[PDB]
Amino acid sequence: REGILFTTLEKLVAWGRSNSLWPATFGLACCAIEMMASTDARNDLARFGSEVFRASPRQADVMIVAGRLSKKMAPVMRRVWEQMPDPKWVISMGACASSGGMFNNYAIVQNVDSVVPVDVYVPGCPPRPEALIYAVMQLQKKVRGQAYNERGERLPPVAAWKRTRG
Amino acid sequence: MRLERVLEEARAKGYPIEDNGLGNLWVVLPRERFKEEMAHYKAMGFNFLADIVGLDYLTYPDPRPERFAVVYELVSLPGWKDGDGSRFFVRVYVPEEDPRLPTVTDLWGSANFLEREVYDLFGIVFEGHPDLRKILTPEDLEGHPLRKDYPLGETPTLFREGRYIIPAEFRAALTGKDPGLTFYKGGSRKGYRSLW
Amino acid sequence: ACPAYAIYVEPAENDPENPVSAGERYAKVYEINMLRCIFCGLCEEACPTGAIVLGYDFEMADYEYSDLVYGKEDMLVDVVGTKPQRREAKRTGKPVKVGYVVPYVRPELEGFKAPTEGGK
Amino acid sequence: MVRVKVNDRIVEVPPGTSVMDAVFHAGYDVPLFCSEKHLSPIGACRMCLVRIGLPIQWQPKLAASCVTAVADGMVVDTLSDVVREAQAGMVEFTLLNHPLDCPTCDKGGACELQDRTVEYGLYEKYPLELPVYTRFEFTRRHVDKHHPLSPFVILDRERCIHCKRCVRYFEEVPGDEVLDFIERGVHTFIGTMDFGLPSGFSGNITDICPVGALLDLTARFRARNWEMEETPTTCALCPVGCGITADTRSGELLRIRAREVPEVNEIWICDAGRFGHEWADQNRLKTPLVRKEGRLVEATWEEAFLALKEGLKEARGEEVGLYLAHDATLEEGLLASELAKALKTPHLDFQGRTAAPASLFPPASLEDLLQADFALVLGDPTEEAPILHLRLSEFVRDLKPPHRYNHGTPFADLQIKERMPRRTDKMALFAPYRAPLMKWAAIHEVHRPGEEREILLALLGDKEGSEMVAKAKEAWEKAKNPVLILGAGVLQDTVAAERARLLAERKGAKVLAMTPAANARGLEAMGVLPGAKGASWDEPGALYAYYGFVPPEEALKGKRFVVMHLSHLHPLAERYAHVVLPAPTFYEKRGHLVNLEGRVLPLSPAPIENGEAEGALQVLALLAEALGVRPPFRLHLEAQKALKARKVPEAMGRLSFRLKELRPKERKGAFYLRPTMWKAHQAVGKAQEAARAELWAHPETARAEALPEGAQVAVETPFGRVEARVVHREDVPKGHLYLSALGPAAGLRVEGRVLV
Amino acid sequence: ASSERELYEAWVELLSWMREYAQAKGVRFEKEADFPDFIYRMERPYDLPTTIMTASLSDGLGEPFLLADVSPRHAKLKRIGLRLPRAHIHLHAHYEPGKGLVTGKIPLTKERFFALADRAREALAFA
Amino acid sequence: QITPPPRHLLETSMEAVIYHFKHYTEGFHPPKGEVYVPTESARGELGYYIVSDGGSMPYRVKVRAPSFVNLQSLPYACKGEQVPDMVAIIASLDPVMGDVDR
Amino acid sequence: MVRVGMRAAPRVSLEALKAALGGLKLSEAKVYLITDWQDKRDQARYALLLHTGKKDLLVPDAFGPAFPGGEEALSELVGLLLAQGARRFYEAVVSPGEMTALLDLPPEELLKRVMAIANPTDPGIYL
Ligand SMILES: COc1oc([C@H]2C/C(=C/C(C)=C/c3ccc([N+](=O)[O-])cc3)CO2)c(C)c(=O)c1C
Ligand code: SF4
């Protein structure tokens, strides 16, 4: 039941969801190889709990927009997001995904917050694997309710909870 | 060895032979003789069909014969049976209001995808094609992008408090038809080439 | 010279009493949209005064597009840490530690204070 | 025509052609510093040097293509290694003492020296050998820097490369020699003992200076030349409508510059047009206001329109007035016209309507003026229609339209030599005051207001005038194709305009009418004039009214409903107006205007911060909806169709329309509304003291009335209460006080009083 | 040789004198221009005591009457120059060690410069 | 004309500053013409067809994407092969869909 | 192509669009919500271009929370477009100064530009 309504249990389930974040890769472009490199035997996101990698979308909570999001791929990825369980988070990786990037044209979605609800933004080209670790830790403390923005507000645990799906 | 005989064959029939001082050769064939001549070209021993590059000269500063122009690349691999290494180009202009061209898919299957791209990017429909279906651009995309009268379709860059940029109004670099920021551009900004 | 056009500079005229820059001109507003920025080095390469030079922080992951436009006073050499890092140190009361070490900082980074290989 | 050859290309070219224009006409290129279009070439920069053979007999030394004429069968060499070598050397000599200020230089990317240096500089010397850029390693020249020459212009004497463009301009174009060098040798520098830069056309050197020496103060340090968003448009402050370029960035007006259109203005803009922009981007109305408790409150367009419906529901169509501004477009004039056709109303008008329309007279092209024989002028061009002055400067120096090459306007017209004489026999001027052009009009007589009509009676031949008027009469009889030019003062007096019409109809002669309103000729063409009842823009006749300008306070007093469509918020409006709405300036509008020569001109919209403003087109369409009448126009495209139906030609096309109707109105003579270049709403920022109001008096009349030579006296006009600095002048007739008409209210003689 | 150092050092002294006059006679003094080979040094070292190269005394109407300039750090024929605009007056000052600042062989004392500036003020100033 | 001035003489020479300013705002203008040269990448023959109109920005750049045409041999090679081996035969075809899609 | 609705009147724009829409089936149509400033939707203003393929429809900038009832009218609008079976939703980002002149360009230019610059959007950001 949304992981809420108990002073202990919401902390417990936020702990669980935050540390057991199970990424759902959507490898698109050169950002995605910097996403793969964050798992090799020098700098691996294989410690916080992200060892296993559920390729199916029915089984994973974190979807990372990793690469330029060409428009012909916008709806498919959309449904990949809709093919996720509801307790799901989406990180926007790179400049091409966060904003239009340098490709400012007819072929690219100029901010992937358009098609999917973004949790964390991570600049870089591609954002260093260590920036990706920093973003997954950002999201870690965000879903515990331990995140505040520049304007002084604490941010909701799960983005994509505030959208009237349709 | 075969490139010399190509030149002797085409120059004998009065087709212009384009050459830059850099070592690449262009051979412009007319529309009619195009298909049959290039069939003879493949028969001449041209294993490999590298490229199909479509061109839109709408906004070119100097006028050109026709707006669209398709260039095929015919090559014979050096390491194959009897390889001279002869590689050359065939340019064929296509009118603005007549975007026709017979395919060489039947000769090289490589023109399956490539010509589709030129049909996708330019308004050029390739005759005799097995499947002329949009390759790259979204299925619902309307138009042909790479022709100059088709917008690049940019989005502004974003900043803090009403401060924005419109890059096409921001560009200090000049195209060919751009007169420049002074009265004009002459000298080394109208074309410059060092003499080795 | 920015291929993404992410750099904004509103100029102004120095005040002779307390000047900000060396010449007659300074940068009132200096914004760089890190979501547009692609990290070329073209702004470093074209800066004639050596002012704008890339640093070493990569730990700039934030939640909001509108907040990822790093300003002038968000990049000065005097500052130690990234925007989410400084906000965490402020809402936490615990000082900033950058998670990187380099053999040395370049001469172009005169003034750039950072951990150097373990010298401290 | 003469046959010329440049390096492989042969061109037919008219005989008086300069080698520089012929080279560019052939498609080649060569530097250019000292010479400039519409400026007398004199060989100074020595950049345009070419090689010449005139038979193979090459000339000994390189010919200055800027000041050299062409002869038949001549060969010109600009690609020989000798030419490029010499050009690089001269570039080095020019760059010699330059301050190294490029990165902070306000000229930025649009600097001729930069481009010609990178074009022709550093010839390829004959390797992978390391090159050295400069040889001069000595102490460079240092002079005074960022020197403010005037509240709009700043002067850096280090960046000057010692061309002649600014001093040559000032001597030739305006006739105001207020800039010239001081010392000689390498110590030479620009200076003046005339500091205020008195000429009102001083701003054009701002564009001409190939360096960042003379720059715009009001647009100093805002953005670089490329960063600015350049939108070409037309200036609608006055009826000459010069072509301008509006440089805007981030929603604010940065800088205004000249756009070349030789049919009307060559490359020139006036100071009122170019530096008079401070009011646009600073303070303007962005949310509609509605009056609820006798005060104005921000309102939704919906609630404003509700109040509009309720207030106009019980309105009969003969009590509604349609009063537009002087900048009202052809589209707007046509929609108000058609709406008053449907909505039967005898009173509509516009801001600068004259008792006698300017459409009464045949419109003349300015180049026709250059070809003309004589100009009988009544009024002051320099103030009433500024750049006319500049064309008069070509007119009286015997200049004529040049021959047209492939690159457009020629680079070096050999027709224009330096220090050219200005003739006293080609024009005759009659003004109520001593205009700056009276120096060049030997026939000149200072009269007082309302006195032209007698000069015109004297010119027709029904009575005898003074010696000056008899000289103008004789010269007007003898001229084969003269021009009659009427100011604003003439256009507001029915009899003087009637006699002008008679005079210029009997003699085949065109007329250049300097309306106080820019698009007055377009609104006339579209039929915007009152009917029988006829409450004019200054009359309190209607009971409901729509205003796009600020009327006299007696026009608002008495009405039942008053809706103003303004751009700023005016104290005159929050005491008598019930609804205020935001309107965009001509800078941010789109449409067409009608020149004082009958020529239609485009307005493109510039990306300025307008707010929630809506054009008078959409406002009238929504305002008729409260009355039942359906509007035929909402958009620009439908208005284009209905214009094309009304048979008004495409842009730059001249509109043919004549008119036979006079509405006489007496004029109460106590104060004069001096026709002025500087306009009232332009007094913001740096133009605050430049666009100040004046009250001119003769020393005796001041002495009698107690008007000090420096006093800020508050003066009350039917057109409002404004304070004005007092000037004593020897050309102002006794008993009159010439009050600066800072609007399109010129040429009016009104009652008044000096409040204490 | 090393005299170079004192040159720029001496230059600062000169500025003080100039500054003094403005505070003395209540006439506008202005820093005109700084050293470009100090602005455009990015990482490169810069040891000179000051970065200001050109200054002037402007009247109320803004036109300067006295100009002073120094040779850049890398330029040949290093000197200090003085000029009176509109008066065709120029001076080439050097510094001879032990003696002091000399116009050729004639030492340039503060009193000399002060009298010169006052003569310029009475002559060239418009207001 | 092709190389910006070295960073050290930006404070000595005027030509340096002008060339640096121009090169980093405008760029340079190569002559009018078309050109193309091939190279060998880990996926084969590669080349750029460059059309320049003498301006600061290229008129057209057409890229011979080796992974683009190397993909035509997918229906052929894996014809009659296994269904899983359709994956191993794609990995063995070595595509980089940044090169294909482009 | 038709232009219905009016600037800065969200409720009137919505009612006129209700009427002009009728029973038009939007199975293959395209809805372009044109705005400025991607990120900040709390203060957004919106235009609409409806590209049916057989005739096109224009709504000026009258919807969004920037106007009173523009948020509720935009929610109702997207619900209305979704009821009629729309699946392909786009958003165009223009410079503010463009938004005004883009409704006065000829249909082919305006529509071509919009289709080229469109971003696929999740309507949940407007519902
Ligand atoms: C495969 O190469 C490539 O991939 C991609 C995309 C797809 C992708 C898949 C998987 C399955 C990652 C993955 C790897 C390892 C694990 N693991 O748990 O070890 C989990 C997941 C990552 O980027 C792109 C774009 C590419 O262009 C190339 C050449
Ligand atoms: S931000 Fe850079 S690395 Fe990431 S997808 Fe874009 S181009 Fe590739």
Ligand code: SF4
């Ligand atoms: S590194 Fe500099 S030039 Fe490159 S994208 Fe970032 S801001 Fe632009």
Ligand code: SF4
């Ligand atoms: S005038 Fe031109 S060359 Fe001189 S400093 Fe300015 S931009 Fe540089």
Ligand code: SF4
């Ligand atoms: S100030 Fe400018 S226009 Fe005047 S002479 Fe010098 S370079 Fe020429």
Ligand code: SF4
């Ligand atoms: S003369 Fe008239 S149209 Fe020309 S710039 Fe001046 S005010 Fe504008």
Ligand code: FES
């Ligand atoms: S020498 Fe200056 S242009 Fe002829």
